[PDB]
Amino acid sequence: PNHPLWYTLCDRYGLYVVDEANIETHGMVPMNRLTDDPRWLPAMSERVTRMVQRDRNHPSVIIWSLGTESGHGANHDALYRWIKSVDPSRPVQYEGGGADTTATDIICPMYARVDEDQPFPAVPKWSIKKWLSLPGETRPLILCEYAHAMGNSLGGFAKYWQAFRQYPRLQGGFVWDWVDQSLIKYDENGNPWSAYGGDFGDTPNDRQFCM
Amino acid sequence: PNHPLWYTLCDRYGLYVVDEANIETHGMVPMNRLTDDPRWLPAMSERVTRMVQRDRNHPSVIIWSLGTESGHGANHDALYRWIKSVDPSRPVQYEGGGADTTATDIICPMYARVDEDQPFPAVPKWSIKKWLSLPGETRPLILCEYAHAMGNSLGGFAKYWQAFRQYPRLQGGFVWDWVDQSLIKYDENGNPWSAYGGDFGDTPNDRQFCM
């Protein structure tokens, strides 16, 4: 959840907002070790419920998210239903566990490609055009992350937009991401420069991957 | 419906057969002028019902067809239901009126392309990949006619098969068609040659379009 003024500004300027719970457990092995554990349900519930209670009157918020990169666990299913029960006005999405689980109203993959399948075990990223028509599938598809804009990037961006426009149920996506997470450091002359992972002595670090 | 031996040979050699009623009213304006007319329902019904009564014990027949190129009339809907009621063991398909009407269990377009839409008014031919995931659509897609093999042709044939293999609900199609409808004529020396429309003084005619 963002600084509260963010939603007021999106209300007034007009942007659609996905409001997302402060839950990510990417580094767990496997990713759902905590989110499938009922012992972590109370901590998770407060991150979801206290978000909804704060932001539910903002028109700009059109979709709730259960967080990111936390696999798919029983705690997600419980909290998905809680939101559906408490606020039927907004769809609930969540990408973990393969982007099309029982805890999401929207097929919301990250970096699924337009035409090319990436058939990973358990969590495949299907071609977005293919994903829509898998046997029994009827949901809209909106990528929660695509077109990773790291450095000299956005090659192939036009391919996404051609597909978005051609397929009714391909309803867009959210670029990753808006702003480089570089930080200003100063050299011996007091001149500013842009720093990334490791430039503060931080170790282990993931270098430029924050930009 | 074919010569009765055809089905016996398909049973024994092993080919899946679409058995099709002898109904085509292509030259009508509009195409459904007769098939929407209850006056033509008795004549159409006999073409459907007597086919089923004749061929329903052949294992090679896996799908019934209501005919071809006769638009979509109320008579098709009546006869679709008649088959569903009398023989539940076989799907019913019919292409007329846009390939995805209430008179067909299978989306069965003719010459719909792989990636390119042809948005004709009333009866568009969508890209087959796009067609599958149109809002609310759930049926399999099997082209009743595709890859028109006229003369030096079948360009782009590989494109269909890549898509057939990638998409579960794209379950193939029927090439148009098997054999040139050319006829034998003879020159002054008795040498045979291949003839097409117009070569018999037949007029109006559609020339080489029979091959």
Ligand code: NA
């Ligand atoms: Na779209």
Ligand code: NA
């Ligand atoms: Na990053």
Ligand code: NA
């Ligand atoms: Na297929």
Ligand code: NA
């Ligand atoms: Na022809």
